[PDB]
Design a protein around this ligand. Structure first.
Ligand code: MET
Length: 239
């Protein structure tokens, strides 16, 4: 049987080619990897049948997408994921924030809510008490303490936005594929609510090939591989 993987370019794809694939091949499987530069196509490909499984999103994003597009897909297991971070732009230190400082952020809702929670934690803005952090939006901002100018861009553009803003909050997968380092972050998301999950069509939830893939992503071998290969990554809660 052939298992078709769909991932964002970079780290999630490397995991498959460097480790997962060879492991599954010694069980008889043939693997095919399809990489995506964007966040929109993977779930569509999975639902359509092009992919048997994709690895590139967190639950809040999956949940938002499934609902908006009515797709029968579901999360299965978590994987080591690059954390969301606030990186230096024109400014080099959190201490340099000015009234009116610009901060770039991804524009899709589930990821944008994260930026607002982070700005709240840093004390640059204050979110209204009791609001759902997973869906935090601008309407939820009680006070913009530092009159921060939030610049919204398509997720894939965040890395090179650093040249035009004071600080940029970059999704990990794009930070890594754009030559950035996790240690360059001035502040990282402390939460574990966004550790990425693999997703499949609800119909395959109990398949034998999926069972083989999930233990491939949880063996002592994979954990050792991940520990040295993706240092600084957030680990699956299950570990
Ligand atoms: C498509 S949701 C964003 C996924 C991205 N790898 C992150 O964890 O920030």
């Amino acid at each position: 049987k052939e298992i078709v993987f769909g991932t964002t370019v970079g780290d999630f794809g490397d995991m498959v080619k460097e480790q997962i694939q060879p492991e599954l091949e010694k069980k008889g499987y043939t693997v095919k990897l399809v990489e995506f530069t964007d966040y929109v196509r993977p779930n569509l490909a999975l639902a359509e049948g092009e992919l048997d499984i994709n690895v590139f999103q967190h639950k809040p994003y999956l949940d938002d997408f499934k609902k908006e597009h009515n797709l029968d897909i579901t999360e299965v297991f978590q994987v080591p994921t690059a954390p969301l971070g606030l990186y230096p732009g024109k400014l080099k230190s959190l201490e340099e924030v000015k009234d009116g400082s610009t901060v770039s952020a991804p524009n899709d809702p589930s990821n944008f809510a994260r930026v607002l929670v982070m700005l709240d934690e840093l004390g640059w803005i204050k979110l209204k008490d009791g609001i759902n952090p997973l869906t935090a939006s601008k309407a939820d901002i009680a006070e913009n303490l530092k009159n921060i100018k939030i610049v919204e861009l398509e997720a894939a553009q965040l890395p090179r936005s650093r040249a035009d803003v004071d600080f940029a909050v970059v999704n990990g997968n794009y930070a890594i594929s754009s030559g950035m380092k996790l240690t360059e972050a001035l502040f990282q998301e402390p939460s574990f609510a966004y550790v990425n999950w693999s997703a499949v069509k609800t119909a395959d939830k109990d398949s034998q090939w999926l069972k083989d893939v999930t233990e491939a992503y949880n063996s002592d071998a994979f954990k050792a591989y991940a520990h040295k290969r993706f240092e600084g990554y957030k680990s699956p809660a299950a570990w």
